[PDB]
């Protein structure tokens, strides 16, 4: 489709944890393609940062809405 993607190589994948990264202090970055099939959708491509404890719940949320997961990595 003649487009680019963000670069998450080396340490560029890292994101700040603080006290918001759950019990394991790990963040997961979910890149998705989404549309409006609920709240208004503002962007066709979105990123979500969720802790390990909420990673399962987030996948079902993305799944229930019919949105596509393009990449998941540790942040």
């Amino acid at each position: 489709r003649n487009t680019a993607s963000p670069v998450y190589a080396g340490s560029t994948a890292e994101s700040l944890r603080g006290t918001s990264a759950g019990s394991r202090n790990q963040m997961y970055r979910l890149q998705v393609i989404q549309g409006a099939a609920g709240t208004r959708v503002r962007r066709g491509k979105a990123e979500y940062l969720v802790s390990y404890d909420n990673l399962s719940a987030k996948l079902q949320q993305i799944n229930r809405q019919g949105d596509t997961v393009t990449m998941i990595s540790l942040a």
């Binding site: 489709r1 003649n2 487009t3 393609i33 549309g35 409006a36 503002r42 962007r43 066709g44 491509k45």
Partner: protein, 172 residues
């Protein structure tokens, strides 16, 4: 977002400088154009539904592939989303005209829009054609000399055309 005034202020603060006399004079000239600016916003807004619907009809007439079955504007949901997108873009163009700065249009509407359309298969070039049709109708509405104090609105019309041009370029 910035307006015409805060844009100059932000640049001056980053340099630690008072606004120069020239910059103040330039903003006074902007103030002098205020009534014409307000009229242009009011005129586009008052005709917004006609501007969108007429442009959409003309767009689909010239590009029948959009509305044929399987077309990206086919089915009620996608047609509705399409008409919504036209209305959104026209709305933010009026916002930029009102503030006198493109930041509201760029930040809130156009940023990410090409990526959204490419991701979802929306033909951006067709969106650009629809924006151009809205541009033509909106500028004609602004330029109508009937029922208004006569004067020169070329500068305001040029500014509005630029916002439409940026919108057309952003999606294509």
């Amino acid at each position: 977002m910035f307006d015409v005034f805060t844009r100059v202020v932000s640049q001056a603060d980053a340099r630690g400088e008072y606004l120069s006399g020239s910059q103040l004079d330039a903003l006074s000239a902007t103030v002098a154009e205020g009534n014409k600016r307000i009229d242009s916003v009011n005129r586009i807004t008052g005709n917004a539904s006609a501007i969108v619907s007429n442009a959409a009809r003309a767009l689909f007439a010239e590009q029948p592939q959009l509305i044929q079955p399987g077309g990206n504007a086919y089915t009620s949901r996608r047609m509705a989303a399409c008409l919504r997108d036209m209305e959104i873009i026209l709305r933010y163009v009026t916002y930029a005209t009102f503030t006198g700065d493109a930041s509201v249009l760029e930040d809130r509407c156009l940023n990410g829009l090409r990526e959204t359309y490419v991701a979802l298969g929306v033909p951006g070039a067709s969106v650009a054609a629809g924006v151009q049709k809205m541009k033509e109708a909106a500028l004609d509405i602004v330029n109508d000399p009937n029922g208004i104090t006569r004067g020169d609105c070329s500068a305001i019309v040029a500014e509005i055309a630029g916002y439409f041009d940026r919108a057309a370029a952003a999606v294509a």
